[model samples]
Target: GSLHMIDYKEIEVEEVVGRGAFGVVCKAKWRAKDVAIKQIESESERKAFIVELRQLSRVNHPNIVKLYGACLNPVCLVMEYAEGGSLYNVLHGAEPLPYYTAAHAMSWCLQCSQGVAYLHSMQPKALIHRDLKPPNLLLVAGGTVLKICDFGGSAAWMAPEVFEGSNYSEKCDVFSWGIILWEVITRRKPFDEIGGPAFRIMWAVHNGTRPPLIKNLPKPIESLMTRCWSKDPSQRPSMEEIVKIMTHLMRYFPGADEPLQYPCQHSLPPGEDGRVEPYVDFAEFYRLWSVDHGE
Candidate 1:
């Protein structure tokens, strides 16, 4: 049966805003509200389209991207347009976001984690966002509010019927969180300039090597990034712990506006080879855990 296309003609498609493996994203207008329309190119892409729309439709969190509607026939997913565009684009354009910007970004990441935490606490089953990178996180008007988008890779983390012995749990989302944290701290694409996944994985595992943390990344934030990118997945902190740590850090070290009185260590600049010290101290870890656990 040929599906009828909705009357989106009234909604003017201004220009192409973003392009990805799935399809093109366009800035569009609906009624008076601005929105982003993601066009799926083929029939096979329809499944993920329906999945994203259906999943986002039920979720009404402020931090998560809201699905406005969809065109079932042509397979286009309508979502709230982020005026500021993606965090990735922002990071790439600017030379290493400042401490204030980094802290604000971290807060957005925390909001994203909270939204995912809500999804993970669902009754039937929890959703794991398998692909949670910086590109999928959006900022609004340079504000700290983050809109977590792209749920095409999400799955029921603990449904035995769906996964069949697979360890696809919320922890997997946490793993992706680790990667995004690294992206935020380093301001470099994971595995970029180092070839593909195999090389990146080996390098990350063999040596705790990663791009230098941006000049202004706070010590608490730097510590968080290290734990998030730990090779041993099991060692990665949980979302609950992440929220607590981020919240604490934000209080003391609120962006670049109010700098903390911590010792600063300069690393060998890019393209140079030398030892880079760990960002956080041992006492800080104990302090974070103690605070979170109310010890």
Candidate 2:
């Protein structure tokens, strides 16, 4: 019971905090502190959990969730309690979408990109978060700091080459980040209309189709999103460059240059500086949409 391993007897498990395709997460008390205990079942899930543990244990960054410990036999991961929960819930949960001032949005996006940049820059080998999405991103510090969690695979956020079973690299994660970038700015589901066969979505992306950019949006942000999902993996920008662009975007909003603050509302405040007209680029998007929807 050493080397980041926690004893079963030491944890007092409580209510279910969350559940996912592979496992369930519980709120537990360990070492007299609150922690989320993710319990995994099945061989595949266990293997992913081990990979998560291995990847998390190797790095430390403010925007990446901290791995407190792990249980060997039953497969439980002890992680920091993110009180603000997943970004997915904030966007599409029971509550209305939170009003995001330009600054607030840029701050959150910058935090996420910084985390990914750190992962991509790891030496010996770069780390790729194959499942980078809102659900896998957790909010902490009362929603001001966004930390990347859940280092596993999810089809919707996956890159085209991954679906092709081709040799891929960290740029795959950049592609997924582009999808998330769209999701964050639009507060809508990615490919919501494509209600599935999943394979269709895969080929749709492999063929160069993507969600339309938001209307009247800042060019820098839109440009970043487009480049991130480029069909050619070599064309995607490095996470470091992404951080620089996002940081510059954050500066446009007068008071939004810092980490976010609470009391975020659901509608844009009248005359907020740096606010753009909330519109989708429907004209250009329809052509791309037709490709996916057409035979």
TM-score of 1: 0.72
Which residue runs of candidate 1 sit more than 4 Å off their true CA positions? 1-6, 94-102, 153-166, 196-223, 255-269, 275-295
* TM-scores of the models, in the order given: 0.72, 0.82
Q: What lDDT tens digits, residue by residue, belong to model 2 across residues 116-217?
A: 999889888888877788888888876778998776555667888999889998898888888887777666667766667888888777787787656666
lDDT: worst 10-residue window of model 2:
268-277
Model 1 accuracy (lDDT, Cα): 0.60
For each candidate, how many residue pairs have backbone atoms clashing (under 3 Å)?
1, 1
Clashes in candidate 1: how many? Answer: 1
Instruction: State the lDDT of candidate 1 residue by residue for 1-295, as single tens digits.
Output: 1222345675667889877548778999887888788887777666676566556667777778777676754567777788767877655544443233445555666877887777776656667666566677777755456778776522211111122345445666775676566555555555555665454445443465555554444466667766765545577688778877777666533453333223323342345234223222234444555676664
**Candidate 1 displacement at residue 217 in angstroms:** 6.6
Distance from true location, Cα of 82 in model 1, Å: 0.3
Please list the residue runs of candidate 2 whose C-alpha ends up more than 4 Å from where it truly belongs after superposition.
1-3, 43-45, 254-295
Best by TM-score: 2
